[PDB]
Design a protein around this ligand. Sequence first.
Ligand SMILES: [Ca+2]
Ligand SMILES: [Ca+2]
Ligand SMILES: [Mn+2]
Ligand SMILES: [Mn+2]
Lengths: 181, 181, 47, 47
Amino acid sequence: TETTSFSITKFSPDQQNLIFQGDGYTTKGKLTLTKAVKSTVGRALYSTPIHIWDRDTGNVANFVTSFTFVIDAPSSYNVADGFTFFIAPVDTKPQTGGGYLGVFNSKEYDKTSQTVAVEFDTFYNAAWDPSNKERHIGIDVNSIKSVNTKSWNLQNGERANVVIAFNAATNVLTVTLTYPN
Amino acid sequence: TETTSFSITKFSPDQQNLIFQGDGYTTKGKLTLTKAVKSTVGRALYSTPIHIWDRDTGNVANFVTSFTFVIDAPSSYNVADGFTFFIAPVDTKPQTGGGYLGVFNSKEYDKTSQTVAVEFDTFYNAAWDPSNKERHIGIDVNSIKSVNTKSWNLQNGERANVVIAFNAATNVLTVTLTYPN
Amino acid sequence: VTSYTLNEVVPLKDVVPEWVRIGFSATTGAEFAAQEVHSWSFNSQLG
Amino acid sequence: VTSYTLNEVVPLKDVVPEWVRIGFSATTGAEFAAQEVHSWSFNSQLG
Ligand SMILES: [Ca+2]
Ligand SMILES: [Ca+2]
Ligand SMILES: [Mn+2]
Ligand SMILES: [Mn+2]
């Protein structure tokens, strides 16, 4: 058995248990991935490596993460590119920016990526985003083109609570996003 | 608020969330700090920095740790030097060996050490151990010379269960060691 | 209160290494916005 | 069952930095022994 838990209800300016990449930084009790500025990227990783599966026994971990986030854009017609929660190898570095969200480099299945991401995509990229052009929540496996998406209406400046759970008995990854209003 | 919690009931050969120093290594589900070999030192650190007090609020963390250890010596009259549980700065490296337990460098109070250790001392060093020459449990703050000690009868090869708790409200550190028989 | 839920089967063991790091990413392009996280909790259990 | 208990007041704020690393140490000299840990749990709460 091996378990791991953590809870941060407020970020320190010197948050030693996190790894920052791109523009990520902590400010005012909050974690800022990007400020409202053009063409930039920011990532923040929890520094402990997590034991996800055991080659030896074939066991896979059960896990759940909860977080509160905010997207603050100039207007509902001027917003891009999005935000993700992702699982990747221990030495992960930012990948392509823009519509690739700093996590993937192609819409084609890249088995070397070894990354799973839950995206909250606010900008429609014709090459791989759902046809309906709506903003959406998507589950990404080794590629920027989602294996499953759900339309989502961005509430600008509002706080969303998200819960992401993985049931190992089942292999099912569940994502719930909630707004107060 | 921040909380951190972890449990390891069996050690992996590739325990990526631990930092090993000296001869420490994992093997057979167990963490080995030293083999029964002369003049050696081993250390193992949890890799994540822990936030113990906050600058700002002046708050101090409450914490509790529990572990099972065994000391296996050739016989009851041939056993040295001991084992410790310690709290140190993030960059901590092994300090002097032998009677210093890999964590201190002197019997004089050293403010720059910034290390608190709970020792399980099996060998009487005349320069600073209790005069009774008994093996003992001790609480060490910036020095190898304990602030408080308790005689302890080593049960050679037996698994000891230890609980170390820190109550931020009273600043009281408590240590309990238990043997089955 | 407005909620959204999405489910999918993902075979973790076949896509990610035994050991991984978890984190958040965000980017902007010609169009942008600020992205920030206010709180974060996590729990996992293997075996 | 046989147990031992010890307690001491330790003003942590004045001795250790705000962020620390926790771990185990063991050494041997001319006399020696094997030192092993079989399991380890840890819980801290700041605030
Ligand atoms: Ca997009
Ligand atoms: Ca000694
Ligand atoms: Mn998308
Ligand atoms: Mn001593």
